[PDB]
Structures are given as C-alpha cells and as structure tokens.
RNA sequence: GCUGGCAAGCGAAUGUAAAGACUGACUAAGCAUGUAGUACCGAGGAUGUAGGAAUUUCGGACGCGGGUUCAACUCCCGCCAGCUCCACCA
C-alpha cells in the first residue's frame, strides 16, 4: 500500500487525491511491479504546479551500469 | 491691438473676434511634382475571418532511433542492459 511509515508515525495524513505523474522510460516499468523509494517525499513549490520532489527512483537492476537511471530527474 | 468720424467718462452706455478662397518659391529656409492636409494618435471609429482566456482534442511515455499496423506501449530493423550456444591457437 506504500503507507509511508515516516508520515504515518509522524504527522498523520489529512488530505489526498488521485493523480498520475510524468516520467520517462528509464524510471518506469518498475513502478508497475511496485519497487520504489517514496519515504518522506520532499515536494516543494515549483512553478509547474509543484513538480514532484524528494522521492528518488527504485534501485532495481534496470541500470546501464553507469547510474541507476537518473540520480536527479 | 495703436488709430480711424464723433457723441460718453478718461475709469463711462460698453464691443460685431469671419479667418476660408486666391498669386506663386513647393521638395516648409538651394533643391522632384502643392491650396487643404497622404501625416500623428490612444481612447476617436471600425477587424472579430484568428490567435491569446474556457471548450473537443493533435502534440507525449514504458530503451532510444527511425523506413512500419496508427489502434504502438514489443506492426518491420541496427544497437545497447542480462541468459544461453558455439565459432575463436600469429
């Protein structure tokens, strides 16, 4: 369910909705399986309607053995 | 506007205020063509056919690139990231 145990133990969630996000082929096809690292995503104000911040990309072996796919994307 | 013919005082009754045509040097004050102005807008008028607001969506991304069914998000190919099989003795 990806409950975000940090945000569960601290400052219980109050409001949420449902929406997707935009990403490239590198950082995709693993979220379909479920692996990810979304613990305490630091989403801050962005001019483009608060672009997703904080959470990185899953460390699954989809790497081109240079980087995972994108250290910062 | 000073004057202009005089009644009215020099501080009195108290003023009509049009301003266009016509000659020409025209390239306004050498020098191209003139008798009303083609300029300049900015709150004076209009475009609203198309680009800006909503509104149907085209655009995108499942690795990329493109010649492919467009319904592509693997319908045809070259690579690269792993598995396997061997070729591979100057």
């Amino acid at each position: 369910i990806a409950l975000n145990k940090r945000a569960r133990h601290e400052y219980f969630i109050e409001e949420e909705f449902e929406a997707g996000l935009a990403l490239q082929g590198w950082e995709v096809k693993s979220l379909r399986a479920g692996k990810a690292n979304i613990s305490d995503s630091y989403v801050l104000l962005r001019d483009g309607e608060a672009f997703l911040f904080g959470a990185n990309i899953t460390p699954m072996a989809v790497a081109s053995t240079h980087v995972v796919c994108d250290p910062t994307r």
Side-chain angles (χ1 to χ4, degrees), chain A residues 15-72:
Chain A
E15 182 181 359
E16 51 82 22
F17 64 94
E18 47 183 359
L21 276 66
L23 78 174
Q24 206 188 0
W26 296 97
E27 62 276 12
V28 82
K29 206 177 60 60
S30 300
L31 304 184
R32 182 250 185 180
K35 286 293 184 178
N37 194 332
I38 55 178
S39 61
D40 193 7
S41 309
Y42 296 92
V43 185
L44 48 89
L45 176 72
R46 296 283 80 178
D47 300 72
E49 278 70 23
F51 285 152
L52 179 67
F53 300 162
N56 59 271
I57 303 94
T58 169
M60 191 183 295
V62 71
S64 182
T65 62
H66 285 62
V67 294
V68 184
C69 278
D70 61 356
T72 299

